[PDB]
Ligand binder design. Structure first.
Ligand SMILES: [Mg+2]
Ligand SMILES: [Mg+2]
Ligand SMILES: [Mg+2]
Ligand SMILES: [Mg+2]
Ligand SMILES: [Mg+2]
Length: 87
RNA sequence: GGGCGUUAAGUUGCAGGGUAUAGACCCGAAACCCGGUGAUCUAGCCAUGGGCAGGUUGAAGGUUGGGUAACACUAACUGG
């Protein structure tokens, strides 16, 4: 992912624009990467070697979302509403 | 010597018997060729119009909500 894009996401989701390790920041980065690779996997359908990384990112995002939902539901709902997710 | 002849009158008309060529005592074919008439029936094609009551199952597809990182998949409705 682009360094400028990562910096923009960190500034948008974090507090001091330097934590860059919060659950919301990680989920946003994973979602952005998945959405960017959506167009890559819509053409190269025989790229399972890179699709495994996408699946790993999906699993990591799901685990982070479950942890956020278990810890603070208020932040989880706001994050999913902002990112357009459904669960 | 042997074969063919010599030694011995035919021809022209009429009538008739017979033969040949023509259809040839008479009727009767399936069939061949040439020139014409027929697609108002029927076979096909083209152009232009008309007709198929009523009652049935419910395909592709299209929204809705979930189900996927999303395509798939799947529930109802609609669709005809
Ligand atoms: Mg002599
Ligand atoms: Mg005489
Ligand atoms: Mg005579
Ligand atoms: Mg005619
Ligand atoms: Mg009818």
């Amino acid at each position: 992912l682009s360094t400028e894009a990562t910096a923009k996401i960190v500034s948008e989701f974090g507090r001091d624009a330097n934590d860059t390790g919060s659950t919301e920041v990680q989920v946003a980065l994973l979602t952005a990467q998945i959405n960017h690779l959506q167009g890559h996997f819509a053409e190269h359908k025989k790229d399972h070697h890179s699709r495994r990384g996408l699946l790993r990112m999906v699993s990591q995002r799901r685990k982070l979302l479950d942890y956020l939902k278990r810890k603070d539901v208020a932040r989880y709902t706001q994050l999913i509403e902002r990112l357009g997710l459904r669960r």
